[PDB]
Amino acid sequence: MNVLIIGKGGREHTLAWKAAQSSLVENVFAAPGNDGMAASAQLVNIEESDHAGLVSFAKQNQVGLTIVGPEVPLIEGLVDEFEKAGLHVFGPSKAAAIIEGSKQFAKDLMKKYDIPTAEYETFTSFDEAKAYVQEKGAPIVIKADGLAAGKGVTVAMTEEEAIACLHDFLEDEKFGDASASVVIEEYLSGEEFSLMAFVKGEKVYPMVIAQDHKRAFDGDKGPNTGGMGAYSPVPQISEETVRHAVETIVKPAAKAMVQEGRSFTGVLYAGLMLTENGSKVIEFNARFGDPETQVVLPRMESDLVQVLLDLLDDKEVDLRWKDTAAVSVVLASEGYPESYAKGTPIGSLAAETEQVVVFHAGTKAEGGEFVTNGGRVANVTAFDETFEAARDRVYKAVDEIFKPGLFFRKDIGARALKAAQ
Ligand SMILES: Nc1ncnc2c1ncn2[C@@H]1O[C@H](COP(=O)(O)OP(=O)(O)NP(=O)(O)O)[C@@H](O)[C@H]1O
Ligand SMILES: [Mg+2]
Ligand SMILES: [Mg+2]
């Protein structure tokens, strides 16, 4: 079989890396893929945005399973297009991807179906949105309804901050239609963790959970990023917490979507906050997480491709997890998340340390070597039998391949390991 992985980030590298291990698979194609992936995937020069070429390529190249990585094509209905051409494709229809594409939709689903989440309301009027902020006071969380570059969320510590954000989103239409509607919701805290599941209609096959660091700097200080590192398991979260999340959030969410005529197939990603009142949904994503995939997938004992094919063909899914631990650290370009420059030479990015995989997020092969090609550059990912050893191993690996234009957080996983004990 030929498998197509769509996209170009670290999640897709992980996907291609895992698929490559399948006994079922003859070719793994990655469109567009990136140069970090060439050992695991034959790169196919088509953009995740180029839906017609993607569909036409898969159709004509005997691609028996397509796995979609990024959210935008899913949200824009790439799966419908694949299926119109009779291609076998894993991921949600445009109707189902709304659970990520429209935060208001997601909050309303949970309201309707008693799935626990932050108390919220949605607005299209600045005046009414501002009044509600002044009523609730700070802290309060302001979210653009649509994707908004991934920049649509402000956790406001003051009313002024919240109202300025509402100004941007609504009066200035900062993100256009994505911010023509806003969700205003309760600030939560506690342990934040990711619970993904393979889902088809009502069937839910949970994955091991992960946790990430979104803050640029150690001590979780500084601006937000697209993720500075992650790990699975999350030591300080019980198995009971996870199983309860699976039972009262993920499965009910999957059921709800069927009952809404938006039957969901793909990875349902639940971003959860373990509060003093228990898990509450911070967000839903309609696809594999980044950077979570990088520590979750490698823990899979099962063959990803077999799982997906069984799931899609309504067969028994035999999905097994390893006890091992995975921990990854992001190398980002100096300056990210603000301004950064592409082109810095950063070497081979090859580790000697064993049980390490570097998933490339923003690299380009240039002159026998790798240069930086984005803010977050690689996810150095180490596996081991305990959290703490995986933790120690990944930082061996990192120093080894570290280079001038890069930074990274040194404390990935340490608060977790500590709070566990
Ligand atoms: N209700 C809330 N209370 C507290 N923090 C929140 C709340 N909603 C969101 N956040 C925080 O805002 C960040 C989430 O913003 P978001 O854009 O959803 O992040 P993300 O992890 O990049 N999601 P995605 O881009 O889909 O992978 C996290 O640091 C959350 O913990
Ligand atoms: Mg999201
Ligand atoms: Mg079988």
Side-chain angles (χ1 to χ4, degrees), residues 1-220 222-351 353-365 367-402 404-421:
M1 187 183 28
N2 297 325
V3 171
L4 178 62
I5 300 321
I6 298 179
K8 58 173 184 208
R11 156 189 47 216
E12 293 80 15
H13 185 169
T14 308
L15 285 170
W17 169 84
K18 186 60 176 181
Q21 297 172 224
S22 172
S23 60
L24 306 171
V25 170
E26 307 181 297
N27 299 298
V28 181
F29 303 125
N34 54 45
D35 294 328
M37 293 185 219
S40 297
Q42 308 166 34
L43 301 194
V44 164
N45 182 36
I46 299 169
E47 289 298 330
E48 62 198 41
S49 180
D50 188 349
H51 291 198
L54 289 174
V55 168
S56 183
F57 179 91
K59 194 154 161 262
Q60 294 182 61
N61 285 282
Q62 335 283 319
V63 167
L65 174 65
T66 293
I67 297 161
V68 179
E71 60 271 21
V72 166
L74 288 171
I75 288 182
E76 286 179 349
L78 173 57
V79 169
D80 306 50
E81 301 299 298
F82 263 64
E83 281 182 345
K84 209 169 308 166
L87 307 170
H88 200 45
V89 65
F90 176 67
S93 66
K94 186 179 200 176
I98 194 175
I99 194 167
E100 186 178 338
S102 163
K103 292 188 191 75
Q104 169 175 18
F105 165 93
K107 297 298 291 196
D108 291 342
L109 198 76
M110 290 183 283
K111 187 166 170 71
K112 180 169 173 191
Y113 290 95
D114 294 345
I115 304 192
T117 193
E119 196 179 320
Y120 79 98
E121 279 170 67
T122 55
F123 300 84
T124 51
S125 154
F126 171 81
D127 287 340
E128 309 169 342
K130 177 180 176 171
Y132 179 82
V133 167
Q134 297 181 323
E135 176 190 290
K136 294 285 151 178
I140 193 95
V141 182
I142 307 302
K143 310 188 174 187
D145 168 55
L147 275 168
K151 300 194 143 170
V153 175
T154 299
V155 182
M157 288 300 348
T158 58
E159 291 180 31
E160 317 190 298
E161 183 181 8
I163 292 160
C165 174
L166 294 176
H167 161 71
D168 294 349
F169 285 4
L170 297 170
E171 289 190 322
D172 284 355
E173 326 194 292
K174 196 187 175 170
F175 295 112
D177 294 18
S179 62
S181 188
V182 184
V183 184
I184 302 185
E185 72 177 31
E186 172 190 12
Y187 173 73
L188 309 177
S189 71
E191 296 287 356
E192 184 178 36
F193 66 105
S194 295
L195 179 54
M196 295 184 266
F198 302 94
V199 179
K200 177 174 209 260
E202 293 194 31
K203 308 195 186 171
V204 175
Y205 300 103
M207 311 192 327
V208 296
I209 64 166
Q211 185 169 56
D212 84 325
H213 289 82
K214 179 164 229 51
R215 288 287 172 187
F217 305 145
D218 302 297
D220 289 279
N224 294 136
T225 68
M228 291 306 294
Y231 39 86
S232 184
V234 185
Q236 73 277 210
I237 303 173
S238 62
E239 182 167 69
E240 168 204 48
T241 297
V242 179
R243 168 185 66 254
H244 187 267
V246 170
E247 286 310 306
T248 72
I249 293 162
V250 180
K251 280 173 179 176
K255 176 144 197 212
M257 291 292 287
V258 170
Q259 301 190 318
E260 286 300 304
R262 294 172 179 278
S263 183
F264 184 105
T265 304
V267 175
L268 181 53
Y269 168 117
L272 304 174
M273 185 92 90
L274 171 44
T275 68
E276 290 221 56
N277 291 271
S279 300
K280 303 194 175 168
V281 170
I282 292 285
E283 62 164 327
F284 285 129
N285 285 336
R287 33 65 186 197
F288 278 109
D290 184 10
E292 292 90 347
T293 301
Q294 288 94 140
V295 300
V296 171
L297 253 197
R299 291 189 61 206
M300 179 183 290
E301 200 184 303
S302 300
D303 168 19
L304 169 62
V305 179
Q306 184 56 269
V307 170
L308 295 183
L309 293 179
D310 287 336
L311 182 72
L312 292 176
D313 211 19
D314 307 300
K315 289 169 176 205
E316 178 82 12
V317 168
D318 188 336
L319 174 56
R320 291 162 201 216
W321 298 93
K322 296 162 168 187
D323 266 325
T324 67
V327 178
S328 63
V329 179
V330 174
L331 299 170
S333 305
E334 266 289 337
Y336 177 91
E338 301 169 342
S339 202
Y340 60 96
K342 296 176 186 182
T344 304
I346 56 187
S348 61
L349 289 160
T353 308
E354 309 188 37
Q355 292 138 51
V356 170
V357 183
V358 181
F359 297 117
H360 293 223
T363 53
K364 175 173 185 225
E369 175 210 32
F370 285 119
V371 295
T372 61
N373 196 34
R376 298 185 303 120
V377 184
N379 306 269
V380 188
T381 306
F383 321 104
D384 216 311
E385 296 185 5
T386 53
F387 192 94
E388 167 151 42
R391 212 203 159 249
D392 278 306
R393 180 180 299 266
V394 73
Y395 280 109
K396 295 182 182 154
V398 173
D399 297 303
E400 290 169 20
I401 70 175
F402 176 80
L406 308 172
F407 69 115
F408 59 91
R409 292 186 48 186
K410 68 217 183 23
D411 68 331
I412 299 299
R415 184 191 62 74
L417 176 55
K418 197 208 168 52
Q421 302 167 338

Coordinates of all heavy atoms in Angstrom, one line a residue, residues 360-412, unseen atoms left out:
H360 N 11.6 16.9 12.5 CA 11.9 18.3 11.9 C 10.6 19.0 11.8 O 9.6 18.6 11.2 CB 12.6 18.2 10.6 CG 14.0 17.6 10.8 ND1 15.1 18.1 10.1 CD2 14.5 16.6 11.5 CE1 16.2 17.5 10.4 NE2 15.9 16.5 11.3
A361 N 10.6 20.3 12.2 CA 9.5 21.2 12.3 C 9.6 22.3 11.3 O 8.7 22.7 10.6 CB 9.3 21.7 13.7
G362 N 10.9 22.8 11.3 CA 11.2 24.0 10.4 C 12.6 23.9 10.0 O 13.4 24.8 10.4
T363 N 13.0 23.0 9.2 CA 14.3 22.9 8.6 C 14.3 22.8 7.1 O 13.2 22.6 6.5 CB 15.0 21.6 9.1 OG1 14.2 20.5 8.8 CG2 15.3 21.7 10.6
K364 N 15.4 23.1 6.5 CA 15.5 22.9 5.0 C 16.9 22.4 4.8 O 17.9 22.8 5.4 CB 15.4 24.3 4.3 CG 15.6 24.2 2.8 CD 15.3 25.5 2.1 CE 15.4 25.3 0.6 NZ 16.1 26.5 0.0
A365 N 17.0 21.4 3.9 CA 18.3 20.8 3.5 C 19.0 21.8 2.5 O 18.4 22.1 1.5 CB 18.1 19.5 2.9
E366 N 20.1 22.3 2.9 CA 20.9 23.2 2.0 C 22.4 23.0 2.3 O 22.9 23.2 3.4 CB 20.5 24.7 2.4
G367 N 23.1 22.6 1.2 CA 24.5 22.4 1.3 C 24.9 21.3 2.2 O 25.6 21.5 3.2
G368 N 24.4 20.0 1.9 CA 24.8 18.9 2.7 C 24.4 18.9 4.1 O 24.9 18.1 4.9
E369 N 23.6 19.9 4.5 CA 23.3 20.2 5.9 C 21.9 20.8 6.1 O 21.2 21.0 5.1 CB 24.4 21.1 6.4 CG 24.3 21.7 7.8 CD 24.9 23.0 7.9 OE1 24.9 23.8 6.9 OE2 25.5 23.4 9.0
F370 N 21.6 21.0 7.3 CA 20.3 21.7 7.6 C 20.4 23.1 8.0 O 21.3 23.4 8.8 CB 19.5 20.9 8.7 CG 19.0 19.6 8.2 CD1 19.4 18.4 8.8 CD2 18.0 19.6 7.2 CE1 18.8 17.2 8.3 CE2 17.5 18.4 6.7 CZ 17.9 17.2 7.3
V371 N 19.6 23.9 7.5 CA 19.4 25.3 8.0 C 18.0 25.5 8.6 O 17.1 24.6 8.5 CB 19.6 26.4 6.9 CG1 21.0 26.3 6.3 CG2 18.6 26.1 5.8
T372 N 17.8 26.6 9.3 CA 16.6 26.8 10.0 C 15.6 27.3 8.9 O 15.9 28.0 8.0 CB 16.7 28.0 11.0 OG1 17.1 29.2 10.4 CG2 17.7 27.6 12.1
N373 N 14.3 26.8 9.0 CA 13.3 27.2 8.1 C 12.0 27.7 8.7 O 11.0 27.8 8.1 CB 13.1 26.1 7.1 CG 12.4 26.6 5.8 OD1 12.6 27.7 5.4 ND2 11.5 25.8 5.3
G374 N 12.1 27.9 10.0 CA 11.0 28.4 10.8 C 11.3 28.7 12.3 O 12.4 28.4 12.8
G375 N 10.3 29.2 13.0 CA 10.4 29.5 14.4 C 10.9 28.3 15.2 O 11.9 28.3 15.8
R376 N 10.0 27.3 15.2 CA 10.4 26.0 15.9 C 11.0 25.1 14.8 O 10.5 24.9 13.8 CB 9.1 25.5 16.5 CG 8.5 26.4 17.5 CD 7.3 25.8 18.3 NE 6.2 25.4 17.4 CZ 5.8 24.2 17.2 NH1 6.3 23.2 18.0 NH2 4.9 23.9 16.3
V377 N 12.2 24.6 15.2 CA 13.1 24.0 14.2 C 13.0 22.5 14.2 O 12.8 21.8 13.2 CB 14.5 24.5 14.3 CG1 15.4 23.9 13.2 CG2 14.5 26.0 14.3
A378 N 13.3 21.9 15.4 CA 13.2 20.4 15.5 C 12.6 20.1 16.9 O 12.8 20.9 17.9 CB 14.5 19.8 15.3
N379 N 12.0 18.9 17.0 CA 11.6 18.4 18.3 C 12.4 17.2 18.6 O 12.2 16.1 18.1 CB 10.1 17.9 18.2 CG 9.2 19.0 17.7 OD1 8.7 19.8 18.5 ND2 9.0 19.1 16.4
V380 N 13.4 17.4 19.5 CA 14.3 16.4 19.9 C 13.6 15.5 20.8 O 13.1 16.0 21.9 CB 15.6 17.0 20.5 CG1 16.6 15.9 20.7 CG2 16.1 18.1 19.7
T381 N 13.5 14.2 20.5 CA 12.5 13.4 21.2 C 13.2 12.1 21.7 O 13.7 11.4 20.9 CB 11.3 13.1 20.4 OG1 10.7 14.3 19.9 CG2 10.2 12.4 21.2
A382 N 13.2 11.9 23.0 CA 13.8 10.8 23.6 C 12.9 9.8 24.3 O 11.9 10.3 24.9 CB 14.9 11.2 24.6
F383 N 13.1 8.5 24.1 CA 12.2 7.5 24.8 C 13.0 6.8 25.8 O 14.2 6.6 25.7 CB 11.7 6.6 23.7 CG 11.3 7.2 22.4 CD1 12.2 7.1 21.3 CD2 10.2 8.1 22.3 CE1 11.9 7.8 20.1 CE2 9.9 8.7 21.1 CZ 10.8 8.6 20.0
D384 N 12.3 6.2 26.8 CA 13.0 5.5 27.8 C 12.0 4.8 28.7 O 10.8 4.8 28.4 CB 13.9 6.3 28.7 CG 15.2 5.6 29.2 OD1 15.0 4.5 29.6 OD2 16.2 6.2 29.0
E385 N 12.4 4.1 29.8 CA 11.5 3.3 30.6 C 10.8 4.1 31.7 O 9.7 3.7 32.2 CB 12.2 2.1 31.1 CG 12.7 1.2 30.1 CD 13.3 -0.1 30.7 OE1 13.2 -0.3 31.9 OE2 13.9 -0.9 30.0
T386 N 11.4 5.1 32.1 CA 10.8 6.0 33.1 C 10.8 7.5 32.5 O 11.7 7.9 31.7 CB 11.6 6.0 34.4 OG1 13.0 6.3 34.2 CG2 11.4 4.7 35.1
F387 N 9.9 8.2 33.0 CA 9.8 9.6 32.7 C 11.2 10.2 32.8 O 11.8 10.8 31.9 CB 8.9 10.4 33.5 CG 8.6 11.8 33.0 CD1 7.5 12.0 32.2 CD2 9.4 12.9 33.3 CE1 7.2 13.3 31.7 CE2 9.2 14.1 32.8 CZ 8.1 14.3 32.0
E388 N 11.8 10.1 34.0 CA 13.0 10.8 34.4 C 14.2 10.5 33.5 O 15.0 11.4 33.2 CB 13.3 10.6 35.9 CG 14.7 11.1 36.2 CD 14.8 11.5 37.7 OE1 14.2 10.8 38.6 OE2 15.4 12.6 37.9
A389 N 14.3 9.2 33.1 CA 15.4 8.9 32.2 C 15.3 9.4 30.8 O 16.2 9.8 30.2 CB 15.6 7.3 32.2
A390 N 14.0 9.3 30.3 CA 13.7 9.9 29.0 C 14.1 11.4 29.1 O 14.6 12.0 28.2 CB 12.2 9.7 28.7
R391 N 13.7 12.0 30.3 CA 14.0 13.4 30.4 C 15.5 13.7 30.4 O 16.0 14.6 29.7 CB 13.5 13.9 31.8 CG 13.1 15.3 31.7 CD 13.1 16.0 33.1 NE 13.1 17.4 32.9 CZ 14.2 18.2 33.2 NH1 15.2 17.6 33.7 NH2 14.2 19.5 32.9
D392 N 16.3 12.8 31.1 CA 17.7 13.0 31.1 C 18.3 12.7 29.7 O 19.3 13.4 29.3 CB 18.4 12.0 32.1 CG 18.3 12.6 33.5 OD1 18.8 13.7 33.7 OD2 17.8 11.9 34.4
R393 N 17.7 11.8 29.0 CA 18.3 11.3 27.7 C 18.0 12.4 26.6 O 18.9 12.7 25.8 CB 17.6 10.0 27.3 CG 18.1 9.5 25.9 CD 17.4 8.2 25.6 NE 17.7 7.2 26.5 CZ 18.6 6.3 26.4 NH1 19.4 6.3 25.3 NH2 18.8 5.3 27.3
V394 N 16.9 13.1 26.7 CA 16.6 14.1 25.6 C 17.6 15.3 25.7 O 17.9 15.8 24.7 CB 15.2 14.6 25.7 CG1 14.9 15.5 26.9 CG2 14.8 15.3 24.4
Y395 N 18.0 15.6 26.9 CA 19.0 16.7 27.0 C 20.4 16.4 26.7 O 21.2 17.2 26.2 CB 18.9 17.4 28.4 CG 17.7 18.3 28.5 CD1 16.6 18.0 29.3 CD2 17.7 19.5 27.9 CE1 15.5 18.8 29.4 CE2 16.6 20.4 27.9 CZ 15.5 20.0 28.7 OH 14.4 20.8 28.7
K396 N 20.8 15.1 26.9 CA 22.0 14.6 26.3 C 21.9 14.9 24.8 O 22.7 15.6 24.2 CB 22.2 13.1 26.5 CG 22.4 12.7 27.9 CD 22.6 11.2 28.1 CE 22.8 10.8 29.6 NZ 22.4 9.4 29.9
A397 N 20.9 14.3 24.2 CA 20.7 14.4 22.7 C 20.8 15.9 22.3 O 21.4 16.2 21.3 CB 19.3 13.8 22.3
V398 N 20.1 16.7 23.0 CA 20.0 18.1 22.6 C 21.4 18.8 22.5 O 21.7 19.4 21.5 CB 19.0 18.9 23.5 CG1 19.1 20.4 23.2 CG2 17.6 18.4 23.4
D399 N 22.1 18.8 23.6 CA 23.4 19.5 23.7 C 24.2 19.0 22.5 O 24.9 19.8 21.9 CB 24.1 19.2 25.0 CG 23.4 19.7 26.2 OD1 23.1 20.9 26.2 OD2 23.1 18.9 27.1
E400 N 24.1 17.7 22.2 CA 24.9 17.1 21.1 C 24.7 17.8 19.8 O 25.6 18.0 19.0 CB 24.5 15.6 20.9 CG 25.0 14.8 22.1 CD 24.5 13.4 22.1 OE1 24.0 12.9 21.0 OE2 24.5 12.8 23.2
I401 N 23.4 18.1 19.5 CA 23.1 18.6 18.2 C 22.8 20.1 18.2 O 22.5 20.7 17.1 CB 21.9 17.8 17.6 CG1 20.6 18.2 18.3 CG2 22.1 16.3 17.7 CD1 19.4 17.6 17.7
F402 N 22.9 20.7 19.3 CA 22.7 22.2 19.5 C 23.6 23.0 18.6 O 24.8 22.6 18.4 CB 22.8 22.6 20.9 CG 22.7 24.1 21.1 CD1 21.4 24.7 21.2 CD2 23.8 24.9 21.3 CE1 21.3 26.1 21.3 CE2 23.6 26.2 21.5 CZ 22.4 26.8 21.5
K403 N 23.2 24.2 18.2 CA 24.0 25.0 17.3 C 23.6 26.5 17.5 O 22.6 26.8 18.2 CB 23.7 24.6 15.8
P404 N 24.3 27.4 16.9 CA 24.2 28.9 17.3 C 22.9 29.6 17.2 O 22.5 30.3 18.1 CB 25.3 29.5 16.4 CG 25.5 28.6 15.2 CD 25.2 27.2 15.8
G405 N 22.2 29.4 16.1 CA 20.9 30.2 15.9 C 19.7 29.7 16.7 O 18.6 30.2 16.5
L406 N 20.0 28.7 17.6 CA 18.8 28.0 18.3 C 18.8 28.3 19.7 O 19.8 28.6 20.4 CB 19.0 26.5 18.1 CG 19.2 26.0 16.7 CD1 19.5 24.5 16.7 CD2 17.9 26.3 15.9
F407 N 17.5 28.3 20.3 CA 17.4 28.1 21.7 C 16.4 27.1 22.1 O 15.7 26.5 21.2 CB 17.0 29.4 22.4 CG 15.6 29.9 22.1 CD1 14.6 30.0 23.1 CD2 15.3 30.4 20.8 CE1 13.4 30.5 22.8 CE2 14.0 31.0 20.6 CZ 13.1 31.1 21.6
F408 N 16.3 26.8 23.4 CA 15.4 25.7 23.9 C 15.3 25.9 25.4 O 16.1 26.5 26.0 CB 16.0 24.4 23.6 CG 17.4 24.2 24.2 CD1 17.5 23.6 25.5 CD2 18.5 24.4 23.5 CE1 18.7 23.4 26.1 CE2 19.8 24.1 24.0 CZ 19.9 23.6 25.3
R409 N 14.1 25.4 25.9 CA 14.0 25.5 27.3 C 14.7 24.3 28.0 O 14.7 23.2 27.4 CB 12.5 25.5 27.7 CG 11.8 26.8 27.3 CD 10.3 26.8 27.7 NE 10.2 26.5 29.1 CZ 9.0 26.3 29.7 NH1 7.9 26.5 29.1 NH2 9.0 26.0 31.0
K410 N 15.3 24.5 29.1 CA 16.1 23.5 29.8 C 15.3 22.7 30.8 O 15.7 21.6 31.3 CB 17.3 24.1 30.5 CG 16.8 25.0 31.6 CD 17.7 26.2 31.8 CE 17.3 27.0 33.0 NZ 16.7 26.1 34.0
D411 N 14.1 23.1 31.1 CA 13.3 22.6 32.2 C 12.0 21.8 31.7 O 11.1 21.7 32.5 CB 12.8 23.7 33.1 CG 11.8 24.7 32.5 OD1 11.8 24.9 31.3 OD2 11.0 25.2 33.3
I412 N 12.1 21.4 30.5 CA 10.9 20.6 30.0 C 10.7 19.4 30.8 O 11.6 18.5 30.9 CB 11.2 20.2 28.5 CG1 11.4 21.4 27.6 CG2 10.0 19.3 28.0 CD1 10.3 22.3 27.5

